[PDB]
Design a protein around this ligand. Structure first.
Ligand SMILES: [Ca+2]
Ligand SMILES: [Ca+2]
Ligand SMILES: [Ca+2]
Ligand SMILES: [Ca+2]
Length: 152
């Protein structure tokens, strides 16, 4: 019950839906730091029937689709399929997208994502981008830009 756990956590009054207040205060009470336009981007993406409310199916679907996207990004970065992402792979991937960066810049990115202080694996990746509403590698790169300060 991934998304059941999350939803049950967020739905404070237990009326079966999560409103924007519950999402905000919820994310803060779970310790996930998000800006209002990120949270609102999540909400607008999730509210398929546009009633200003997230029911369980909408929530579950958003997180499912998002997880698929992030998994796709991960597997697109992992060139040698070792289930991990090395800095050189970030360099190559960004190079195919017309960005030339150095090894220490990629290392900087990875360290911004890693906690083990090694390179990042699928668990850290997934956890890091779980509530980050980036939709693809481009948006991930833009996020890396305002996160690390490097202009990429
Ligand atoms: Ca509610
Ligand atoms: Ca809705
Ligand atoms: Ca790899
Ligand atoms: Ca690591």
């Amino acid at each position: 019950t991934r998304y059941e756990t999350l939803f049950q956590a967020l739905d404070r009054n237990g009326d079966g839906v999560v409103d924007i207040g519950e999402l905000q205060e919820g994310l803060r009470n779970l310790g996930i730091p998000l800006g209002q336009d990120a949270e609102e981007k999540i909400f607008t993406t999730g509210d398929v029937n546009k009633d200003g409310k997230l029911d369980f199916e909408e929530f579950m679907k958003y997180l499912k689709d998002h997880e698929k996207k992030m998994k796709l990004a991960f597997k697109s970065l992992d060139k040698n399929n070792d289930g991990k992402i090395e800095a050189s792979e970030i360099v190559q991937s960004l190079q195919t997208l017309g960005l030339t960066i150095s090894e220490q810049q990629a290392e900087l990115i990875l360290q911004s994502i890693d906690v083990d202080g090694t390179t990042v694996d699928w668990n850290e990746w997934r956890d890091y981008f779980l509530f980050n509403p980036v939709t693809d590698i481009e948006e991930i790169i833009r996020f890396w830009k305002h996160s690390t300060g490097i202009d990429i």
